[PDB]
Amino acid sequence: LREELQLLQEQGSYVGEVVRAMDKKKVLVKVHPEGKFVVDVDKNIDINDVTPNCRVAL
Amino acid sequence: KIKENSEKIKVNKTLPYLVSNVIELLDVDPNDQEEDGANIDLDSQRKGKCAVIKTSTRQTYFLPVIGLVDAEKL
Amino acid sequence: IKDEQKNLKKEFLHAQEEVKRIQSIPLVIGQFLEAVDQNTAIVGSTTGSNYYVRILSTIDRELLKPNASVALHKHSNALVDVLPPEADSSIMMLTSDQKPDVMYADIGGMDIQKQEVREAVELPLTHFELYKQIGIDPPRGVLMYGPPGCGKTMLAKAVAHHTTAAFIRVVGSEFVQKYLGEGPRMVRDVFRLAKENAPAIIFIDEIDAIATKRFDAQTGADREVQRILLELLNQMDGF
Amino acid sequence: MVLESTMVCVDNSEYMRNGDFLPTRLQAQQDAVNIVCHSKTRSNPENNVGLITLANDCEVLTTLTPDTGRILSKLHTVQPKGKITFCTGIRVAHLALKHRQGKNHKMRIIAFVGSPVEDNEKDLVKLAKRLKKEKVNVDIINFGEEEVNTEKLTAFVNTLNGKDGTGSHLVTVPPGPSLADALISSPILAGEGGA
Amino acid sequence: KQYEKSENDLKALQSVGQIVGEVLKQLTEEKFIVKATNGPRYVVGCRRQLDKSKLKPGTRVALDMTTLTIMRYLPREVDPLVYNMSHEDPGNVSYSEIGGLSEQIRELREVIELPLTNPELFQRVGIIPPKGCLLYGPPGTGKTLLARAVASQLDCNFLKVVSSSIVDKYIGESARLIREMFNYARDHQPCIIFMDEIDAIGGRRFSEGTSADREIQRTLMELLNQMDGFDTLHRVKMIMATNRPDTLDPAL
Amino acid sequence: RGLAVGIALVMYGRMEEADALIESLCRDKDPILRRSGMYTVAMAYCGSGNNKAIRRLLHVAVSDVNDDVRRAAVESLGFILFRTPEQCPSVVSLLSESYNPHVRYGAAMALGVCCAGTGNKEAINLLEPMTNDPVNYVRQGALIASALIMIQQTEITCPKVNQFRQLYSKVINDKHDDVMAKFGAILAQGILDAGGHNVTISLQSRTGHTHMPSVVGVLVFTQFWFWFPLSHFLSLAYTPTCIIGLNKDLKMPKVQYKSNCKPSTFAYPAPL
Amino acid sequence: APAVDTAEQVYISSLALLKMLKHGRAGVPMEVMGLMLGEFVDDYTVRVIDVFAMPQSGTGVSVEAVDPVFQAKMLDMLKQTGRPEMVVGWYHSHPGFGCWLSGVDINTQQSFEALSERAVAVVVDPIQSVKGKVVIDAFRLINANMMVLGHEPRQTTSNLGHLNKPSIQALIHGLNRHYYSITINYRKNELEQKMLLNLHKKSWMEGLTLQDYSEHCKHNESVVKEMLELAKNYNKAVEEEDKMTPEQLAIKNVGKQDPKRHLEEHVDVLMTSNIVQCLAAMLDTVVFK
Amino acid sequence: MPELAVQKVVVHPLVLLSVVDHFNRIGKVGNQKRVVGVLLGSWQKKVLDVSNSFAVPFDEDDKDDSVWFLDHDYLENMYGMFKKVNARERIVGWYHTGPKLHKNDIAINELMKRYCPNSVLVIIDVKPKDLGLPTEAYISVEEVHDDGTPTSKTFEHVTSEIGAEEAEEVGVEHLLRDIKDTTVGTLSQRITNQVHGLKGLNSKLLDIRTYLEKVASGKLPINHHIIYQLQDVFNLLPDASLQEFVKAFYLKTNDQMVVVYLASLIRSVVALHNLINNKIANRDAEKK
Incomplete structure (x- = not known):
């Protein structure tokens, strides 16, 4: 319970979807109400374990 | 002393600053609006010269207006 | 150790006060899209922006699971708490504070039309049980057509006045807001109020300025109208 | 005079309202309290006064303040049905003097008696023993125990002085005209210590 | 004066600037749900001090941005364009000029002047008083002038409105002005609302349109619902001036 | 704080007589006084391990949510039980689970003292998750307690000392970071190397029954959360681990003795 | 340096914790403060015997918030009862920020700091503090320049830590720099506790x-x-x-x-x-x- | 000025706590003497919500209920400083330090009226008495008796309850080394309240009983009103006792067992045959 406030407090979040996934170790995501952004891959999800048009959390 | 009290405001006061327009001009008392009763019979409305402002980002912000150029001119 | 449990429960209850502060204001209201998993879920806040956010102490997917309002904490955007569907419904059940000026004293005629509307609109509200039983399938929406002034809205107005309730009047320019993203979010809540307190009537005065079969869809202004129509269709099956 | 907490006890009785001291005592004492208060304040201003009624059921009108206004107000009105009860006023003065707004001062009681005492010989010797142990003294402006009574006070006053580090004084104002509003002549202008 | 700025500004900085909101609906008078004019909906508190009665669905509140408790009460909803139109009356306009056409001025007068003093006069006959005067007349007659003149004479509050100032790029901003011109007019009753050249707001049936047309049908839609719809006009009379009415929607 | 440890030394080998004293102290109004009782039983009961002593410490701990009494109680148990040191990891584990990280610091200590001359397998693994935890004071208890059991043994034979050396060096260099983790790493370093690997703090004497100098020095030592100099008392605790001859003429005669050692598995360590 | 500068544990009496909370709660959302009256003992014990509040305003937790009228008046009362006390420091509530100091708080904290190096700024639980179990911490505020000289580490020593995050990493950075969650203990005796435990006398009938x-x-x-x-x-x-x-x-x-x-x-x-x-x-x- | 304006006294845990503190601090004025102090909170209203209390200098001589000193200045200044901070804050009344009810308090009540309308007597004791709060709330009532003077000034008890603000309540928990003993909540609390009532009932009967013996021989003064009310308790004598029973719980437990047992039973069948093979696995897993 103690830990939950720390996890819970965060800058926020966004929901985007992978438009395209590179071979440069960046992923093309469009966040739904804003424009497109090119961003580095995380530990959990990267190019080999993603297929495009899969909604992904940020 | 003015600069010192103003000092917390002064950091926000500098760049960036937006522009906006005046939905209404509210001419009331210079400082402290009326006091409401119930449990603790004292102020919750402390509004001095005030303006209800609509920004041009299509957002609305309430703010108590500066005592140097008052609401009344606006 | 049996005593230690009892003390740990004491520590627990004091520790619970810590979650309780995030659970209280400031809070933002969102709507639950669906639960992808326990610890995190996909939610859509009332800004027309969607966030992937955490669930505080693994709240049960029961009456959370289908489309409902939920409480989120503002400064984190986290899903702290749940709200029922009735909470944060846009406008209240109307035609009990904004009743029309018209009765069946303005129209005594169009007899066949009068007979039809009363059986179709008024009666399933009263006795759903008789209306299902008879061999007419459960209530679905009505479309009223005609040339201007014929009283398509008039018969709807008339019936709503007599009832005093089971009617939500919404203006079709209330869907729209100044500020983008909010415009479809409005539609869902108001339309949802009807569903919880069923049978209830959602009556739109003039469906046009939204029911365009053509959108420009290049300026933000056009896009927003296109988003109201898109929500509407989805929601129609939802009722 | 300097570092003193004072309880001025105003007598309110059927006796204190006569034409004994022109025009009537009620006006005459009002002049008298202003002269003692001011006199003490004038000497060095660091003394304060309080107000208690010596007579009947004790009431604390005021605790320590310099203010003359309160003494002047209490004095003009008097109960017809009142009479002195010396024991209650001494008891209460001592108790009040302990707690103070300005707290540093020595304990002295100043009392007006414009009535013959209504308490017996056992009572008067009892009170004198209490005053002496606490080393808290009473200065008395006495016209009252002259009225149809003997001066019981006279004995106590001598005993109390010397031993106590506070002073007591017997101030004599003859019964009938002699004034009792022209206080400068017979000193109880300020309370004197004994040490 | 400068010391004064600092103190009044101090109150705002607590909140990190206060935000306008309005009660989206009353669920209780302690916890309200508020819709924000800056955008998202919230569930907010109320002060243990504030009179609970002041806060209602119709009225506006300000909230702390940092703890969403209703900090204070704000007056009703208003639009800056409306506020100036109502406050001002330039030009004035003499009644004498429209004159000599005098019979035609009477017909107008029945709708505009009589319900303002009392609606009782029309109530007596049995029927609600008409809403919305359409002045039409060959070019250059005085249609716009007639509206202005009768108003100037009565000395009741008068909104003179540019109809090409009602529409703007931003969507539902155009929806807001029409309900707003009436709402201000209802607050300050007895009143006259004048829109000149009603053609600007008037749209067609469209849906082959442009963005400009897109906006026009929506203003058109809102006007119907306030004017003769479920909502009604207790003494606000609306004066329309038109050179040729043949641009307006068929419902209108 | 100083008194609270103090009442305990003078009661040494009272056994049951200490019970009346701990109960009173615990009954007392002030929360600080409740801590002072725990000391009293800790010193007195050593040289035994009895039912009587344990039951009251635990009593204090459950009745009170209070962070200090729980942590306090757990340490004293480990001293009573070191006359059958195997019992201690079982009981200390239950208490560590609790919501207060405070209890955990004491848990670390309890184990340390019990095992201090020679330990168990179980005692080391219990301590080990606390070392990793990033709550500063739980990590602090863990690191110091580990050093005590391991004392006067070669760094090669132990993998844990080698690990701890790397950890120590980074934390001491950082100046701005919280004091308790720094203090755990250093106290545990200094102990390990102690006397160039020649002094031990024995769990109990090598004649048969409990080392007095070790128990006094170690008990005050456990406190350094407020006022640091108390930790130095650990000098009194050290026991020399070699025999020294003596004879009629007042000389030392040459004593050769057999020892379970080889110089081909044990050689003089140096830290980092 | 022969300088003291260290972390100060606050020993809070039972009247003082309940009273500060009450003020803080009453004060929401406007930031409200008040003085801590006490005695100093030991060399890091600052004891709050009692507290009083400075008026509830939208201008509080500023050097403007402290009034000479209220402070003097309040001190004068204590004398008749015969209680001598010194101003040990000050307490406040921020209900639009956590249990960390905010920018507006800094001016006041500084003035009291210069006067007594043993005056602290205590943030008292209102209802905004996310990590709030009624965790009260007392901090002092220094600047970056001071830290590199090495004034900053002194302050941090001799306290037990605890991590909070009620407003993201920016709060945490300030939190570490200050003292880093200083330990608060409470002075109570058994008699006072028992009065707080029972709801009323009437349970006797009511049960x-x-x-x-x-x-x-x-x-x-x-x-x-x-x-x-x-x-x-x-x-x-x-x-x-x-x-x-x-x-x-x-x-x-x-x-x-x-x-x-x-x-x-x-x-x-x-x-x-x-x-x-x-x-x-x-x-x-x-x-x- | 009104005495009658109380029927409910709600007191914060702060005021109750505050008196305990003032006894020692004030310089131990009390014992034979008394310390009465002003109560700050809501007044001019029926339900009294006491926010706070502070001590006022008082020297009491009990025996003679005509002699006392009370600080005249204290009430005025103290009310003004507090008012600004919270404007509900006014002078609610005064506390008396017991040990219980007296007649000496009657004399004391009259002077309080001139300063502020109040006459509420709250007897907050610093000495533990009762299983609950040693607090009583009293409202001055006028009743006629026919044993003594006609029309007496006396106290009828009026119900006392407690409050607390939300932060303040969590604060009450923080000081305690417990939460609370009762709240009349779930299964566990609810019984604790019943046995607390029963002990509380026994304490009540004894006060009345001991007193009647004393009237019977060795005279104490009596009132016609108390004597009548006691007689009534005998006269009212209950009727018959019936109804109330449950058994519901056993089904809940029983259904629960078969759901947890479902897993156990399956684990039992696999586990037994596995038992010799498990030794090689366990060793291996444990080895590294």
Whole structure:
């Protein structure tokens, strides 16, 4: 319970979807109400374990 | 002393600053609006010269207006 | 150790006060899209922006699971708490504070039309049980057509006045807001109020300025109208 | 005079309202309290006064303040049905003097008696023993125990002085005209210590 | 004066600037749900001090941005364009000029002047008083002038409105002005609302349109619902001036 | 704080007589006084391990949510039980689970003292998750307690000392970071190397029954959360681990003795 | 340096914790403050004997918030009772920020700091502090320049830490720089505690007091009817319903309006009420008759 | 000025706590003497919500209920500083340090009226008495008796309850080394309240009983009103005792067992045959 406030407090979040996934170790995501952004891959999800048009959390 | 009290405001006061327009001009008392009763019979409305402002980002912000150029001119 | 449990429960209850502060204001209201998993879920806040956010102490997917309002904490955007569907419904059940000026004293005629509307609109509200039983399938929406002034809205107005309730009047320019993203979010809540307190009537005065079969869809202004129509269709099956 | 907490006890009785001291005592004492208060304040201003009624059921009108206004107000009105009860006023003065707004001062009681005492010989010797142990003294402006009574006070006053580090004084104002509003002549202008 | 700025500004900085909101609906008078004019909906508190009665669905509140408790009460909803139109009356306009056409001025007068003093006069006959005067007349007659003149004479509050100032790029901003011109007019009753050249707001049936047309049908839609719809006009009379009415929607 | 440890030394080998004293102290109004009782039983009961002593410490701990009494109680148990040191990891584990990280610091200590001359397998693994935890004071208890059991043994034979050396060096260099983790790493370093690997703090004497100098020095030592100099008392605790001859003429005669050692598995360590 | 500078534990008396909280709560959302009256003992004990509040305003927790009228007036009262105290420091609530100091707080903290190096700024729980169990911490605020000189580490020494985050990493950076959650203990004795434990004297009557029998009998009847409904749903469920995840359980074992839970709540409330209501009436009857 | 304006006294845990503190601090004025101090909170209203209390200098001589000193200045200044901070804050009344009810308090009540309308007598004791709070609330009532003077000034008890603000309540928990003993909540609390009532009932009967013996021989003064009310308790004599029973819980437990047992039973069948193979696995897993 103690830990939950720390996890819970965060800058926020966004929901985007992978438009395209590179071979440069960046992923093309469009966040739904804003424009497109090119961003580095995380530990959990990267190019080999993603297929495009899969909604992904940020 | 003015600069010192103003000092917390002064950091926000500098760049960036937006522009906006005046939905209404509210001419009331210079400082402290009326006091409401119930449990603790004292102020919750402390509004001095005030303006209800609509920004041009299509957002609305309430703010108590500066005592140097008052609401009344606006 | 049996005593230690009892003390740990004491520590627990004091520790619970810590979650309780995030659970209280400031809070933002969102709507639950669906639960992808326990610890995190996909939610859509009332800004027309969607966030992937955490669930505080693994709240049960029961009456959370289908489309409902939920409480989120503002400064984190986290899903702290749940709200029922009735909470944060846009406008209240109307035609009990904004009743029309018209009765069946303005129209005594169009007899066949009068007979039809009363059986179709008024009666399933009263006795759903008789209306299902008879061999007419459960209530679905009505479309009223005609040339201007014929009283398509008039018969709807008339019936709503007599009832005093089971009617939500919404203006079709209330869907729209100044500020983008909010415009479809409005539609869902108001339309949802009807569903919880069923049978209830959602009556739109003039469906046009939204029911365009053509959108420009290049300026933000056009896009927003296109988003109201898109929500509407989805929601129609939802009722 | 300097570092003193004072309880001025105003007598309110059927006796204190006569034409004994022109025009009537009620006006005459009002002049008298202003002269003692001011006199003490004038000497060095660091003394304060309080107000208690010596007579009947004790009431604390005021605790320590310099203010003359309160003494002047209490004095003009008097109960017809009142009479002195010396024991209650001494008891209460001592108790009040302990707690103070300005707290540093020595304990002295100043009392007006414009009535013959209504308490017996056992009572008067009892009170004198209490005053002496606490080393808290009473200065008395006495016209009252002259009225149809003997001066019981006279004995106590001598005993109390010397031993106590506070002073007591017997101030004599003859019964009938002699004034009792022209206080400068017979000193109880300020309370004197004994040490 | 400068010391004064600092103190009044101090109150705002607590909140990190206060935000306008309005009660989206009353669920209780302690916890309200508020819709924000800056955008998202919230569930907010109320002060243990504030009179609970002041806060209602119709009225506006300000909230702390940092703890969403209703900090204070704000007056009703208003639009800056409306506020100036109502406050001002330039030009004035003499009644004498429209004159000599005098019979035609009477017909107008029945709708505009009589319900303002009392609606009782029309109530007596049995029927609600008409809403919305359409002045039409060959070019250059005085249609716009007639509206202005009768108003100037009565000395009741008068909104003179540019109809090409009602529409703007931003969507539902155009929806807001029409309900707003009436709402201000209802607050300050007895009143006259004048829109000149009603053609600007008037749209067609469209849906082959442009963005400009897109906006026009929506203003058109809102006007119907306030004017003769479920909502009604207790003494606000609306004066329309038109050179040729043949641009307006068929419902209108 | 100083008194609270103090009442305990003078009661040494009272056994049951200490019970009346701990109960009173615990009954007392002030929360600080409740801590002072725990000391009293800790010193007195050593040289035994009895039912009587344990039951009251635990009593204090459950009745009170209070962070200090729980942590306090757990340490004293480990001293009573070191006359059958195997019992201690079982009981200390239950208490560590609790919501207060405070209890955990004491848990670390309890184990340390019990095992201090020679330990168990179980005692080391219990301590080990606390070392990793990033709550500063739980990590602090863990690191110091580990050093005590391991004392006067070669760094090669132990993998844990080698690990701890790397950890120590980074934390001491950082100046701005919280004091308790720094203090755990250093106290545990200094102990390990102690006397160039020649002094031990024995769990109990090598004649048969409990080392007095070790128990006094170690008990005050456990406190350094407020006022640091108390930790130095650990000098009194050290026991020399070699025999020294003596004879009629007042000389030392040459004593050769057999020892379970080889110089081909044990050689003089140096830290980092 | 021969400098003291260290972390200061605050020993809070029972009147002082309850009073500060009360003020803080009353004050929401406007930031409210007040002075700590006390005595200093030891060399890091600052004891708050008592507290008073400076008025509730939108201008508080500023050097403008402290009024000479209220402070003097308040001090004068204490003298007649004969209580000598010094201004040990100041307490405040921020209900639009956590249990960390904010920018507006800094000017006030500095003035008290210069006056007494043993005056602290204490943030007291209001209702905004996310990590709030009524965790009160006292901090002093320095700047970056001072830290590199090495003034900063002194302050941090001799305290037990604890991590909070009620407003993201920016708060944490300031939190570490300050003292980093300083330990607060409370001075109490057994007599004061007992007064706080009991709600009222009236429990003596009230514990015994029963409604009307008819109403008790109704309660039993209402629950039974409720339970009877849930029963059908239990029957399918029993085949599993030991499974993790409520989403999965929703279909399998009727995890949508969970029958185990509904039944357990109905049984607990019914149980305690029926026994207590029977026991009371029956016990009273034997004593009275 | 009104005495009658109380029927409910709600007191914060702060005021109750505050008196305990003032006894020692004030310089131990009390014992034979008394310390009465002002109560700050809501007044001019029926339900009294006491926010706070502070000590006022008082020297009491009990025996003679005509002699006392009370600080005249204290009430005025103290009310003004507090008012600004919270404007509900006014002078609610005064506390008396017991030990219980007296007649000496009657004399004391009259002077309080001139300063502020109040006459509420709250007897907050610093000495533990009662299983609950040693606090009583009293409202001055006028009743006629026919044993003594006609029309007496006396006290009828009026119900006392407690409050607390939300932060303040969590604060009450923080100081305690417990949460609370009772709240009349779930299964566990609810019984604790019943046995607390029963002990509380026994304490009540004894006060009245001991007193009647004393009237019977060795005279104490009596009132017609108290004597009548006591007689009434005998006269009212209950009727018959019936109804109330449950058994519901056993089904809940029983159904619960078969759901947890489902897993156990399956584990039992696999586990037994596995038992010799498990030794090689366990060793291996444990080895590294």
